[PDB]
Design a protein around this ligand. Structure first.
Ligand SMILES: *[C@@H]1O[C@H](CO)[C@@H](O[C@@H]2O[C@H](CO)[C@@H](O[C@@H]3O[C@H](CO)[C@@H](O)[C@H](O)[C@@H]3O)[C@H](O)[C@H]2NC(C)=O)[C@H](O)[C@H]1NC(C)=O
Ligand SMILES: *[C@@H]1O[C@H](CO)[C@@H](O[C@@H]2O[C@H](CO)[C@@H](O)[C@H](O)[C@H]2NC(C)=O)[C@H](O)[C@H]1NC(C)=O
Ligand SMILES: *[C@@H]1O[C@H](CO)[C@@H](O[C@@H]2O[C@H](CO)[C@@H](O)[C@H](O)[C@H]2NC(C)=O)[C@H](O)[C@H]1NC(C)=O
Ligand SMILES: [Mg+2]
Lengths: 91, 274, 528, 640
């Protein structure tokens, strides 16, 4: 499966990803960002769902996994001063 | 700022050149290439680090092969700060202390760990990390009344990059440049201005200094303070009335890697192939 | 639904073109329509409706719809029980299935309803998100509204301003809140006086003719006219296109004036008459102004300058008149002999400084001569009596920046009612003197004392021209034209506002400029 | 005595190529020409210099084009001019011309028409010149909140981007509801600002749409039947709606509405259709004014509301601005010239429209003066009339009416205009008229331009040629000659219409001779002509599928795109449920030409008060060495 970004948006991360035998997608998470916020777009790891579009300072986001799947990492990440989301990327 | 290096040059009555650099290894000191000239001999160039009173004796100054500041006099361009980088190989090995430490350089195994990336990280991936497509938050060290102080700035690498580059037309001499892209090569990072914030402007004495990105409790040099559009610095204070087009340009280290990787090969910095 | 695709082509050859909308309908025989509100209040029991459509032409469907469990909601559906009904949907019809739930937590939550038909390979599900706004009401307290303006309410150029924390005493329990800090520049454009209408100057276009002096008197009204119209840009109302006819007159008079240029690079009424120090210096004044209008020979322009410096100049820097012009009316306020050393030395000195940028390469003794004359005028400026001399001399010192202290105080107080430098007798001498003073003010950049002066000249309606008006014409329009360039539209707009929050390590620095003024610059803070 | 003339547009444009027509009457052999353009005021040289030689092999016409800076020397208020100069060997002819700071056109496109707080606005800026072509320019972009205060501003550049600037703005969760605005402009033209609006509001897309189309696009006052309105409601996927409808009426006169509580109805919606009527009784009873003619001019508005039997969705619709006119038609002389030639035929461009503004197809029109002289209105809503004029210098007054059968004279429309005589140089009664067969012109066809002359045989043998100039989008598309032998009162011009003439083009023709006592006389005339307004090239979007049935949620479908070669195609798909809440500010090709045409340097539909007037009114500046020059132009936009 391959990923593509709308106009005015830059793509960082694996453009093409392949479903491997370990039940995981190859490469890194695809993220379509416009680089217009204090912090960059945290992205939406495959299999999860992000709640929070504002990427200002002090802002936050929350991730939820599909039914039957367990979330690894942080479920909530806050944009900290110095351009860097707290916690770690979900999975 | 242990990596901070203070470079001075003595010239026959002409005056003294005041630049800065960074300690990248036990022998080398990365700085700007316009701080020196082919005429300046080693005996007239003194480098001081760690705040030590004494001056270190240099062995040789390595300019970048493509550095030609006068390669535009025909087109009517007096200055041409393209590939404005140089290394200073010391005559003595530096003893790393609490005042003297190196600063991380792009595309090195040592930097990968600093960013906490997998060892299998390619050079290209590091650039996407350090210099993403946005307004990257950075900083540089300036001299404030014989006292070093940091200055936080924003590298306009996003969509504001265009707004920042074209402002080079206001710079002295460039006023009659046909294509502004002819004086701002892809080897330049742009900082300063009013958007998204009011960034501090680099001074003449800060020229050659490191453009640092503080991430995850680690400092990574990604540029060398080359030249600014407006000279707000004037050994009396800082021109409290800075224009909106007062931009500052630097040298993107990811653009002179071949030269760095080569000259520093015997420094155990572990540069990445790519 | 039906998607409306819209295409826009851009050809470098053809051009731009937006195509006609292309619609694409996307329907299904059996589907679920889960319509949810924009937002719902927490803890308040609401009802959502699930409409199961059945567009099968002739066949009823035995469906079984179910609502999935969600900890963020409170329905009859638990983790171990399935809240599911079984209904029969007639052909070409629909059915609504009621669902009662209660939002247990705020934020964007997920609702999902599935359904499958019996005895068929048909099924469908819908998963949408609904907002859960906390119970209460959207309020907004204006903490404060300060005015930024160092100097007026500042100190040493800086201005500190504390801002008390928000009240929020009656805030709803367990709810967020953001403080919206906001800056904006406020222009502030003012001043500038009206310029004299070009329509009032349809008589200054005179054809230069006569002897070495009568030629200059006829060339002056034309040169200073075009010069005033080029600045104020009033060629539209004046006539336009007629400017070409005015230029040929300036060039015509220029060439004629050369016929009265003696080999000594000086000038006089006739080629036989003794050289005149004043007329020669005056020629430099006019020529140095018409350099932007026509082609002026540097050999001639600098020739007259060198003649004044080397020949007609004492070590004192004083310039003396040997052969006064026959036309004592074109010399303006110099006809009166009270203080001729201070008046003539200044008059000639000005002509040199207005040609300094031109004769700075050919005449090496210029910067020296300029300094000499300046030293003499600065020694007798405190002894002057007539308001006229005080002006013409003050403007000469102003161009050097040597008009400070006592000398500056006298130049300002000399003006009666702080709007004119007048002397008992004649009009020519009053308008001319005031014009010199105005040029001196514009030189000192004191735009606080200027408005009254400029307004006075305007409220006196002097359109030049006439007998002996050579000096009053060239000077009054030279000063008013200069005022139209040194006149700002607004005042300085460069605010360096920086706000430091206790919850933040670094300051938030902003800079407001004139152009970027009136710009909404907000910094949000989820913390009070 | 040789005469050298020069013709350039009233206003010169920066960073473009303005055409310049050179002529010489008559002289012989070769004649070198050195065109030099300076600034103003002052002879500050040089902006653009060109050269050319007029050879008798080309009938003494030259095609020289120059490109004006493109200089930072052109920087508030007032206007800037340039000294356009042309030397014909020795005789120098000069003329000052106005300069426009306008760079070109900017078009802003937004995916949706309305956005919810939290979403992102995807918009694109198109950077074209004064010819609608891609170009690399620096553009300033602002974003004003509903209260007109900028919240974000950037400085982009379409350089190396092919005249397309992809952009986006993130809408804060805590944002201000209302009509937001995206303003933009070229850096070299801060005054000329382009803008597009988009609504920010909390909403949810409906499941079906609602339409309210009255039986007529207006209402006749004395119509006892009343106002019958149809209520069509169907789902977004085509199917028909089953529900109830609440319809009400009201009157609008000014920026003020007056509801009619008495006109409330509740009609059923079966098979996705309904029917409601507004009794004339309730209408008149709505107000209170005994007279019914006082309602003439006012308008009615309908407010419908459909509700499904499931009570799951509810949509509100509205049809406002229903003209209550006495005559089902209107007449406008906006396309007809305001100047006539004594004795010569005077043509009229009658513009018959409907109460709403839409063109009226096939509508008989005639003049109070002569009967039988009629002409059925075409599809474009334009008729072709032509009345005879007397040699008198008395102002001409025309009154055109509608001989539409099936309608009394009391229910017909009427309009009256006034034309003025064409002043003659020396009263020599020398005129010129350009009659053109009024038919819908289309790219690729051919148009016959007629040159009708009027003068005594005393000097008719001196008229050996005319000089026609094609005006288009504010530039010189082409300039040629039209031969003529002594005795020919009417000649024809084989004009080929291409894609360039789009959307509209003006045609000016002038002839010069030494008739009368002995003095270079000039006579000219202009005529505006519309062309089938459409895309210069082409762009189609049809389905790739082999027809078949309808797609299914989550299916692949082919999308065929037929456009021009090497062209860039930017796409966008929008749910029709969106336009149900807002269908305004949609980017359309018709709206593009609208901007182009509403920017012409010409004002008068044709002809003028004299020879130097026809030029200025058309958009040209005639200047010669004999003395005859056109009027001065200071204002940028047309008068009034
Ligand atoms: C994600 O997948 C696509 C599909 O492969 C990648 O685009 C492809 O780029 C490659 C390298 O240029 C192209 O390979 C071509 O294969 C044909 C086969 O005959 C050969 O004739 C060409 O010489 C060439 O080797 C391929 O055409 C192209 N696919 C397209 C344009 O449809 C893309 O790079 C991948 N994204 C990543 C991983 O960054
Ligand atoms: C806080 O700000 C809001 C939004 O500006 C204010 O809401 C006002 O309410 C009126 C009611 O008629 C509406 O027209 C507008 O939404 C707002 N009015 C204007 C013009 O500001 C609100 O008043 C403010 N504070 C309060 C009392 O809630
Ligand atoms: C422009 O200059 C030349 C004459 O020197 C002509 O331009 C031609 O335009 C026609 C179409 O009308 C083309 O077929 C020719 O190819 C063009 N010439 C060239 C050299 O390409 C014409 O006389 C002038 N056109 C205008 C603007 O009137
Ligand atoms: Mg048309």
């Amino acid at each position: 499966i391959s990923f593509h970004c709308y106009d005015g948006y830059t793509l960082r991360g694996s453009a093409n990803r392949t479903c491997q035998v370990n039940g995981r997608w190859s490469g890194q998470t695809a993220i379509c960002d416009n680089g217009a916020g204090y912090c960059s777009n945290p992205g939406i790891p495959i299999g999860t769902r992000k709640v929070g579009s504002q990427y200002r300072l002090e802002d936050s986001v929350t991730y939820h996994c599909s039914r039957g799947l367990t979330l690894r990492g942080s479920q909530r990440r806050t944009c900290q001063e110095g351009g860097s989301w707290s916690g770690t990327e979900p999975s | 700022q242990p990596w901070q290096a203070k470079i001075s040059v003595i010239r026959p009555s002409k005056g003294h050149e005041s630049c800065m650099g960074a300690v990248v290894s036990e022998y080398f000191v990365l700085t700007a290439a316009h701080c020196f000239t082919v005429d300046d001999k080693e005996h007239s160039i003194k480098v001081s680090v760690g705040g030590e009173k004494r001056d270190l004796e240099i062995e040789v100054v390595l300019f970048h092969p493509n550095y030609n500041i006068n390669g535009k006099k025909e087109a009517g361009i007096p200055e041409f700060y393209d590939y404005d980088v140089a290394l200073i190989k010391l005559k003595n090995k530096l003893k790393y202390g609490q005042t003297i430490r190196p600063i991380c350089l792009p595309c090195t195994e040592g930097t990968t760990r600093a960013l906490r990336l997998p060892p299998t990280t390619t050079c290209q991936q590091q650039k996407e990390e350090l210099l993403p497509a946005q307004d990257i938050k950075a900083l540089f060290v300036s001299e404030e009344e014989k006292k070093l102080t940091r200055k936080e700035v924003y590298i306009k690498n996003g969509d504001k990059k265009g707004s920042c580059e074209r402002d080079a037309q206001y710079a002295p001499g460039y006023d009659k440049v046909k294509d502004i892209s002819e004086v701002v090569t892809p080897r330049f990072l742009c900082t300063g201005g009013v958007s998204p914030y009011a960034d501090p402007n680099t001074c003449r004495g800060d020229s050659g200094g490191p453009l640092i990105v503080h991430k995850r409790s680690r400092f990574i040099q990604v540029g060398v303070i080359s030249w600014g559009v407006v000279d707000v610095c004037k050994n009396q204070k800082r021109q409290k009335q800075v224009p909106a087009h007062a931009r500052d340009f630097h040298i993107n280290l990811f653009q002179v890697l071949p030269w760095l990787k080569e000259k520093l090969q015997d420094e155990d910095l572990g540069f990445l192939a790519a | 639904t039906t998607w409306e695709i819209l295409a826009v082509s851009m050809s470098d050859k053809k051009g731009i073109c937006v195509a006609d909308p292309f619609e694409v309908t996307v329907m299904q025989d059996f589907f679920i329509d889960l319509r949810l509100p924009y937002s719902v209040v927490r803890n308040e029991q609401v009802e959502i409706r699930a409409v199961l459509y059945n567009y099968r032409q002739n066949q009823e469907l035995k469906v079984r719809v179910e609502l999935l469990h969600n900890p963020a909601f409170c329905s009859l559906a638990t983790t171990k029980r399935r809240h599911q009904q079984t209904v029969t949907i007639p052909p070409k019809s629909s059915l609504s299935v009621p669902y009662v739930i209660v939002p247990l937590k705020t934020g964007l939550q997920e609702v999902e309803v599935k359904a499958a038909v019996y005895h068929h390979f048909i099924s469908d599900g819908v998963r949408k998100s609904l907002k859960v706004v906390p119970e209460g009401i959207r309020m907004n307290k204006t903490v404060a509204v300060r005015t930024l303006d160092p100097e007026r309410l500042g100190r040493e150029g800086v201005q500190k301003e504390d801002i008390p924390p928000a009240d929020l005493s009656d805030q709803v329990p367990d709810t967020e809140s953001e403080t919206r800090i906001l800056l904006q520049g406020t222009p502030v454009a003012q001043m500038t006086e009206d310029a004299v209408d070009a329509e009032r100057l349809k008589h200054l276009i005179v054809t230069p003719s006569g002897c070495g002096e009568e030629n200059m008197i006829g060339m002056t009204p034309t040169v200073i006219a075009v010069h005033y119209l080029d600045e104020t840009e009033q060629w539209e109302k004046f006539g336009l296109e007629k400017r070409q006819g005015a230029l040929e007159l300036i060039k015509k008079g220029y060439t004629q004036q050369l016929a009265f240029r003696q080999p000594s690079s000086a000038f006089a009424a006739f080629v036989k008459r003794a050289p005149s120090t004043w007329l020669t210096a005056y020629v430099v004044k006019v020529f140095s102004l018409a350099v932007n209008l026509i082609a002026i020979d540097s050999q001639v322009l600098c020739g007259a300058v060198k003649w004044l410096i080397l020949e007609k100049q004492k070590p004192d820097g004083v310039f003396q008149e040997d052969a006064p012009v026959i036309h004592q009316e074109m010399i303006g306020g110099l006809r009166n002999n009270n203080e001729k050393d201070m008046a003539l030395t200044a008059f000639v000195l000005i002509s040199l400084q207005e040609a300094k940028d031109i004769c700075e390469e050919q005449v090496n003794s210029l910067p020296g001569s300029i300094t000499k004359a300046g030293d003499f005028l600065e020694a007798n400026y405190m002894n002057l009596q007539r308001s006229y001399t005080v002006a013409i001399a003050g403007y000469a010192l102003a161009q050097m920046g040597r008009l400070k202290g006592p000398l500056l105080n006298k130049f300002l107080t000399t003006a009666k009612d702080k709007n004119r430098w007048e002397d008992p007798g004649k009009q020519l001498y009053n308008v001319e003197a005031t014009s010199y003073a105005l040029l001196a003010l514009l030189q000192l950049k004191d735009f606080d004392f200027v408005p009254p002066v400029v307004r006075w000249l305007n409220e006196q309606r002097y359109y030049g021209g006439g007998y002996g008006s050579t000096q009053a014409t060239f000077m009054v329009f030279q000063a008013l034209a200069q005022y139209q360039k040194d006149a700002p539209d607004h005042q300085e707009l460069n605010l360096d506002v920086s706000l430091q929050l206790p919850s933040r390590s670094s300051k938030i620095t902003h800079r407001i400029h004139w152009e970027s003024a009136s710009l909404l610059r907000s910094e949000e803070t989820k913390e009070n | 005595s040789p005469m050298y003339s020069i013709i350039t547009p009233n206003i010169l444009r920066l960073e473009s190529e303005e055409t310049m027509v050179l002529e010489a009457h008559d002289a012989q052999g070769d004649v070198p020409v050195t065109v030099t353009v300076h600034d103003f005021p002052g002879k500050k040289l040089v902006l653009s210099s060109e050269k050319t030689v007029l050879t008798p092999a080309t009938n003494h016409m030259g095609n020289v084009t120059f490109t004006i800076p493109a200089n930072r020397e052109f920087k508030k208020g007032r206007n800037k001019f340039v000294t356009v100069q042309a030397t014909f060997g020795t005789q120098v002819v000069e003329k000052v011309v106005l300069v426009s700071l306008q760079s070109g056109y900017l078009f802003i496109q937004t995916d949706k028409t309305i956005y919810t707080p939290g979403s992102t606005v995807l918009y694109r800026i198109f950077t074209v010149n004064h010819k609608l072509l891609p170009v690399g320019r620096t553009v300033m972009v602002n974003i004003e909140n509903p209260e007109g205060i900028p919240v974000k501003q950037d400085s982009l550049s379409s350089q190396n981007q092919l005249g397309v600037l992809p952009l986006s703005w993130d809408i804060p969760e805590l944002v201000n509801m209302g009509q937001w605005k995206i303003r933009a402009y070229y850096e070299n033209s801060p005054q000329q600002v382009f803008s597009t609006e988009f609504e920010v509001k909390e909403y949810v897309l409906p499941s079906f749409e609602v339409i309210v189309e009255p039986t007529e696009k207006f209402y006749y006052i004395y119509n006892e039947k009343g106002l019958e309105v149809t209520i069509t409601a169907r789902f977004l996927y085509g199917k028909k709606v089953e529900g109830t409808a609440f319809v009400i009426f009201g009157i609008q006169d000014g920026e003020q509405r007056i509801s009619l509580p008495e006109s409330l109805k509740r009609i059923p919606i079966e098979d996705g259709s309904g029917e409601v009527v507004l009794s004339r009784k309730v209408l008149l009873d709505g107000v209170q004014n005994p007279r019914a003619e006082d309602l003439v001019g006012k308008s009615l508005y309908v407010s419908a509301t459909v509700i499904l039997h499931s009570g799951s969705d509810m949509v509100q619709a509205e049809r406002s601005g229903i003209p209550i006119v006495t005559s089902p038609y209107q007449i406008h002389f906006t396309k007809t010239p305001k100047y006539f030639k004594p004795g010569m035929p005077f043509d009229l461009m009658v513009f018959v429209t409907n109460p709403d503004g839409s063109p009226a197809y096939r509508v008989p029109v005639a003049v109070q003066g002569e009967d039988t002289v009629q002409s059925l209105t075409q599809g474009d809503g334009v008729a072709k009339l032509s009345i005879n004029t007397h040699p008198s210098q008395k102002p001409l007054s025309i009154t055109v009416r509608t001989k539409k059968q099936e309608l009394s004279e009391a229910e017909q429309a009427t309009r009256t205009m006034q034309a003025l005589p064409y002043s003659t140089v020396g009263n020599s009664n020398n005129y010129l008229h350009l009659s053109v067969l009024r038919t819908e012109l289309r790219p690729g066809e051919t148009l016959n331009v007629n040159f009708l002359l009027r003068m005594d045989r005393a000097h008719e043998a001196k008229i050996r040629y005319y000089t026609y100039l094609i005006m288009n989008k504010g530039r010189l598309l082409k300039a040629g000659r039209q031969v003529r032998e002594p005795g020919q009162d009417l000649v024809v011009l084989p004009l080929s219409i291409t894609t360039d003439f789009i959307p509209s083009f003006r045609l000016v023709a002038y002839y010069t001779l030494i008739g009368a006592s002995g003095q270079r006389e000039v006579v000219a005339d202009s005529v505006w002509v519309d062309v089938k307004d459409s895309c210069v090239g082409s762009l189609v979007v049809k389905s790739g599928q082999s027809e078949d049935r309808q797609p299914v949620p989550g299916q692949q479908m082919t999308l065929k795109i037929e456009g021009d070669h090497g062209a860039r195609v930017v796409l966008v798909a929008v749910d029709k449920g969106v336009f149900v809440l807002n269908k305004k500010n949609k980017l359309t090709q018709s709206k593009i030409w609208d901007v182009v045409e509403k920017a012409d340097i010409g004002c008068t539909p044709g002809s003028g008060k004299d020879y130097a007037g026809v030029f200025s009114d058309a958009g040209l500046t005639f200047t010669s060495s004999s003395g005859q020059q056109t009027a001065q132009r200071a204002e940028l936009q047309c008068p009034q």
